Design an enzyme around this catalytic site. Structure first.
Site, PDB file in Angstrom:
ATOM      1  N   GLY D  13       0.936  -1.163   0.012  1.00 40.45           N
ATOM      2  CA  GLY D  13       0.021  -0.093  -0.065  1.00 40.45           C
ATOM      3  C   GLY D  13       0.792   1.208  -0.042  1.00 40.45           C
ATOM      4  O   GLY D  13       0.300   2.333   0.344  1.00 40.45           O
ATOM      5  N   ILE D  20       0.465   5.927   4.600  1.00 43.53           N
ATOM      6  CA  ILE D  20       0.779   5.587   5.822  1.00 43.53           C
ATOM      7  C   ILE D  20       1.605   4.246   5.914  1.00 43.53           C
ATOM      8  O   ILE D  20       2.299   3.993   7.106  1.00 43.53           O
ATOM      9  CB  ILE D  20      -0.812   4.931   6.462  1.00 43.53           C
ATOM     10  CG1 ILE D  20      -1.563   6.441   6.714  1.00 43.53           C
ATOM     11  CG2 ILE D  20      -0.584   4.049   7.691  1.00 43.53           C
ATOM     12  CD1 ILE D  20      -2.884   5.946   7.627  1.00 43.53           C
ATOM     13  N   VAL D  65      -4.412  -5.915  -5.898  1.00 41.48           N
ATOM     14  CA  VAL D  65      -5.199  -6.692  -5.036  1.00 41.48           C
ATOM     15  C   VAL D  65      -6.528  -7.217  -5.848  1.00 41.48           C
ATOM     16  O   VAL D  65      -7.221  -8.107  -5.684  1.00 41.48           O
ATOM     17  CB  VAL D  65      -5.585  -6.206  -3.764  1.00 41.48           C
ATOM     18  CG1 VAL D  65      -4.518  -6.063  -3.059  1.00 41.48           C
ATOM     19  CG2 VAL D  65      -6.427  -5.007  -3.801  1.00 41.48           C
ATOM     20  N   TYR D 155     -18.301   9.360   4.506  1.00 46.79           N
ATOM     21  CA  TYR D 155     -17.408   7.828   4.836  1.00 46.79           C
ATOM     22  C   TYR D 155     -18.293   6.847   4.206  1.00 46.79           C
ATOM     23  O   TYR D 155     -17.601   5.988   3.593  1.00 46.79           O
ATOM     24  CB  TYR D 155     -17.105   7.856   6.248  1.00 46.79           C
ATOM     25  CG  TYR D 155     -15.669   6.818   6.345  1.00 46.79           C
ATOM     26  CD1 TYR D 155     -14.650   7.423   5.724  1.00 46.79           C
ATOM     27  CD2 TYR D 155     -15.749   5.779   6.895  1.00 46.79           C
ATOM     28  CE1 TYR D 155     -13.454   6.463   5.811  1.00 46.79           C
ATOM     29  CE2 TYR D 155     -14.605   5.076   7.011  1.00 46.79           C
ATOM     30  CZ  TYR D 155     -13.540   5.427   6.467  1.00 46.79           C
ATOM     31  OH  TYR D 155     -12.434   4.513   6.554  1.00 46.79           O
ATOM     32  N   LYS D 162     -14.741  -0.595   6.794  1.00 37.99           N
ATOM     33  CA  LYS D 162     -13.822  -0.732   7.791  1.00 37.99           C
ATOM     34  C   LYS D 162     -14.447  -1.617   9.025  1.00 37.99           C
ATOM     35  O   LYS D 162     -13.693  -2.464   9.625  1.00 37.99           O
ATOM     36  CB  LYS D 162     -13.551   0.730   8.341  1.00 37.99           C
ATOM     37  CG  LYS D 162     -12.774   1.256   7.260  1.00 37.99           C
ATOM     38  CD  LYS D 162     -11.432   0.566   6.850  1.00 37.99           C
ATOM     39  CE  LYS D 162     -10.529   1.500   5.973  1.00 37.99           C
ATOM     40  NZ  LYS D 162      -8.944   0.805   5.931  1.00 37.99           N
ATOM     41  N   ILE D 191      -4.163  12.717   9.063  1.00 38.50           N
ATOM     42  CA  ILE D 191      -3.083  13.224   9.131  1.00 38.50           C
ATOM     43  C   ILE D 191      -3.006  14.489   8.300  1.00 38.50           C
ATOM     44  O   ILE D 191      -3.518  14.526   7.067  1.00 38.50           O
ATOM     45  CB  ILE D 191      -2.039  12.158   8.829  1.00 38.50           C
ATOM     46  CG1 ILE D 191      -1.957  11.138   9.622  1.00 38.50           C
ATOM     47  CG2 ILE D 191      -0.461  13.044   8.730  1.00 38.50           C
ATOM     48  CD1 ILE D 191      -1.151  10.030   8.884  1.00 38.50           C
ATOM     49  N   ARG D 192      -2.469  15.590   8.717  1.00 39.81           N
ATOM     50  CA  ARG D 192      -2.506  16.714   7.915  1.00 39.81           C
ATOM     51  C   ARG D 192      -1.266  16.641   6.825  1.00 39.81           C
ATOM     52  O   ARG D 192      -0.342  16.361   7.275  1.00 39.81           O
ATOM     53  CB  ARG D 192      -2.074  18.086   8.639  1.00 39.81           C
ATOM     54  CG  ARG D 192      -2.209  19.379   7.791  1.00 39.81           C
ATOM     55  CD  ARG D 192      -1.462  20.609   8.427  1.00 39.81           C
ATOM     56  NE  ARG D 192      -2.494  21.199   9.264  1.00 39.81           N
ATOM     57  CZ  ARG D 192      -2.239  21.526  10.673  1.00 39.81           C
ATOM     58  NH1 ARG D 192      -1.115  21.110  11.104  1.00 39.81           N
ATOM     59  NH2 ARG D 192      -3.009  22.060  11.316  1.00 39.81           N
ATOM     60  N   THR D 193      -1.951  16.863   5.496  1.00 37.10           N
ATOM     61  CA  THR D 193      -0.822  16.960   4.445  1.00 37.10           C
ATOM     62  C   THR D 193      -1.231  18.088   3.514  1.00 37.10           C
ATOM     63  O   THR D 193      -2.291  18.483   3.520  1.00 37.10           O
ATOM     64  CB  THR D 193      -0.433  15.677   3.729  1.00 37.10           C
ATOM     65  OG1 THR D 193      -1.924  15.172   2.933  1.00 37.10           O
ATOM     66  CG2 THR D 193       0.042  14.489   4.399  1.00 37.10           C
ATOM     67  N   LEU D 194      -0.020  18.082   2.674  1.00 35.79           N
ATOM     68  CA  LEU D 194      -0.229  19.258   1.608  1.00 35.79           C
ATOM     69  C   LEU D 194      -1.521  19.418   0.738  1.00 35.79           C
ATOM     70  O   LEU D 194      -2.215  20.071   1.048  1.00 35.79           O
ATOM     71  CB  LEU D 194       1.079  19.593   0.863  1.00 35.79           C
ATOM     72  CG  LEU D 194       1.416  18.802  -0.701  1.00 35.79           C
ATOM     73  CD1 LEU D 194       0.640  19.545  -1.679  1.00 35.79           C
ATOM     74  CD2 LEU D 194       2.776  18.730  -0.719  1.00 35.79           C
ATOM     75  N   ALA D 195      -1.761  18.105  -0.038  1.00 36.43           N
ATOM     76  CA  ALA D 195      -2.766  17.792  -0.866  1.00 36.43           C
ATOM     77  C   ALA D 195      -4.052  17.810  -0.042  1.00 36.43           C
ATOM     78  O   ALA D 195      -5.247  18.299  -0.492  1.00 36.43           O
ATOM     79  CB  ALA D 195      -2.308  16.598  -1.501  1.00 36.43           C
TER      80      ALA D 195
END
Lengths: 262, 273, 258, 272
Positions: D13, D20, D65, D155, D162, D191-195
């Site tokens: 992944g 992650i 997969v 979601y 999940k 999680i904080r990210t740019l995109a």
């Protein structure tokens, strides 16, 4: 007095008079509900029609949830005959027998998809199809089992399906609550091979030292379908003689299960 | 003439016609129950007696759960007047005011003990006291709140108490299940009342529930009472050790409710302002 | 000497080298921690002091959590010797349910639950940014277990406290967690039963070891778990997942096979 | 004294350096692990191969997969190159984009099946394929989210997936525990990210988490990676069938955080 007097309900999943859907339907009838029933195929039609008449219903519709083309006729039938719905019972679960053997690891992709489609997606398609006919205050009930959130032997993929199903209940509760429609799951214990053992394990180890009856499951379902539970939505309601609280085998310190061997 | 036709029940915790215990009692009365009531004190007695009269009950007993001297007479009264019991409602919850102020970290030991004694141990003492009078099939119901299993503001020690209470329910369900007696907890959402509308912290929790619950409403006293009656009646004879949520679905929410606005998932609370 | 260098921790609840608090202390020592220990009384002192400097600690302080007079000297001692704290281990154990006296109920609640509040409140001013507070619990908090009774009430309250304290202390970037341990075999009729039972029915078909509980505790006390707070972390060979007894073909219980 | 020295693990992944699976791989590498990686296709191999090379790994294998024919070669590859495995990271989740908008009620059967297959069944197929290669003491880790057990906005079907995934973790823990193999799920906060902060819905959930979590922060990729490493290492020897929350404590909140001031409760969210 009748808690569903004058309320219209669709019962999905009656196979015979021992079906959970029948117990629920019978208690709803005893509370004054106007009932309608579906049948899977011609074989189950021979059992559903006498049951439907037993419970004062001439409203009997074909529904195989795996056949997409059945949903639009069902809608039309309900609208013509009943006009609207005050509750839906969704009592539909199936996996291939083999997927219910051995280990989860050996589950085939097709068996997985069939279990998920029949046991989980069918609630989405049924509710979405009937979604416009549901009155203010309507209640949608599905059926589940402790194997969703704990390991139980001989559940395998059905445990995955029921977990998704309980999650669906929560999401549907949010989707439909906007329109004052409730969605809940009744988590039933086993009702009197592997089944004899789980029955006896539950009977020996449940707090109430008995298996639940079809009538107890039916009365709890009727409660969730009635306005008595209008404050209850998104709930997984255990009707299992208390079994869900047990963290281990019951004892008297020797296990009751051991005493039973003599 | 319904599900409690002719079943005998003791109602603990009526303070006025807004008490949860009163809603439950009213629903039980509507289902044919023979009711009895306790009163904490004479001021509350002036109030338990007209409610008792309204629900066809001449059975009104003093019970301050903090006084151990009151339990044996309660038993003696119930045995004298009713002979046996088919259900008990335990609607008792108390912490000193300062304990719901500030943080859990600042709780005094005396306040901690008072909260645990009144809110938790009293269920044990009441049930043990009345245990010989409980008939086959009897049902014992207590009251709880989401603060047992999640953080809720201005709850502090009560969240500890309610957690213990729910654990007590499980253990009692095992103890009493041998005798085919059921024990359950009703976890209620907040109820809008005139008096509650006079307090700011309560106003916030009610408004938060109303905006964010799936059913976009606060539960009514009638809804809590009907769910309680169900748990006390034979309709729920398959149900024991259960924590049953009557909260308009609020317990399912993992975050604030949103509405898709101007293509963005805006919180419903923000639209309110 | 990796993840707990130079990190200072107070270990509450060592009775001997088989105590849960000792296993956790051992794992923390192996990761380089500077340790301090409490003792219940002089009898336990005689046993805590040798263990401590076995873990390179001369910092051994009196704490009977039932006595308010002990808490301030403890603060003073810690401030004097260590200056600040990066973690606390709260491993304190003590007590039909219907037959429980108000006396026994209050003692169980005070010792098992309130002591975490008083200990954490006493030592809060000394807790550094990022500090971690760990307590111990058991599945009897949320499921019925035999011969647990009032302790199941206490541990339920304790896990709830973990949540509330996590909110109280997280404001200062301090974490609070509970380790829910399965039973550990040590060299009592009911304990023997719960132990074989756990061993037979757990997914891993074993009882957990003191080292496994200690390493999980170390993880929760270390910066490795800096994203984890308010958690009840099960270290029980997987037992918590079981909804019934384990089985082996024609529906035979593994329990019936031994 | 690396927690995974000499231990061989397969990472499924990785898409990029914000994945992650990559954070977990990095922490495992820092603890001495011998790593192997899968890539979805030729396009994702461009990113996976160099990431693998920076973590000293030549073991880079194709795995989509959804394509059953990839699994048997993967086995053959691992068998040839590594001989055995001590851990597996399964970080794979996908739903069609319309299903993650609107309501669950509108989900198509095709979208539902794709979500269930990619997000849930893939763990079964991966674990069943690689089971004969799993050493005593091995650890299998998958990834989850609070939407499995609570409602989370936008979601929908993934919350169903999940939930099923966490149930699978329990059943697999029983299946594999008889061979002293562990199975767990890491439930990560956002999680904080740019995109990821350029999408409005993700930015809202990220800020809601930051404001209302006990630790008043979003979790970092490093924090998720270290928790994953712990669950994959012998340190968590006693842990199986667990859903382990790495979310700055967010999961404990029953409501929005408030502060108290001058006898008035204000939602922290409203102070921003």
């Amino acid at each position: 007095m009748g808690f569903l007097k004058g309320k219209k309900g669709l019962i999905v999943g009656v196979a015979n008079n021992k079906s959970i859907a029948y117990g629920i339907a019978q208690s709803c009838f005893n509370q004054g509900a106007t009932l309608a029933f579906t049948y899977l195929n011609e074989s189950l039609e021979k059992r559903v029609r006498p049951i439907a008449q037993e419970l004062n219903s001439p409203y009997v519709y074909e529904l195989d949830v795996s056949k997409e083309e059945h949903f639009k006729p069902l809608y039309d039938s309900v609208k013509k005959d009943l006009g609207s719905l005050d509750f839906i019972v969704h009592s539909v679960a199936f996996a291939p027998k083999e997927a219910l053997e051995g280990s989860l690891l050996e589950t085939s992709k097709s068996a997985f998809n069939t279990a998920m489609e029949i046991s989980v997606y069918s609630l989405i398609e049924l509710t979405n199809t009937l979604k416009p006919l549901l009155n203010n205050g309507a209640s949608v009930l599905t059926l589940s089992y402790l194997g969703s959130t704990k390991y139980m032997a001989h559940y395998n993929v059905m445990g995955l399906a029921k977990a998704a199903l309980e999650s669906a209940v929560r999401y549907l509760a949010v989707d439909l609550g906007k329109h004052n429609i409730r969605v809940n799951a009744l988590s039933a214990g086993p009702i009197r091979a592997d089944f004899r053992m789980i029955l006896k394990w539950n009977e020996i180890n449940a707090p109430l030292r008995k298996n639940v009856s079809l009538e107890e499951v039916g009365n709890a379902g009727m409660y969730l379908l009635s306005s008595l539970s209008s404050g209850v939505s998104g709930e997984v309601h255990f009707v299992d003689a208390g079994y869900h609280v047990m963290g281990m085998g019951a004892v008297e310190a020797t296990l009751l299960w051991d005493l039973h061997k003599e």
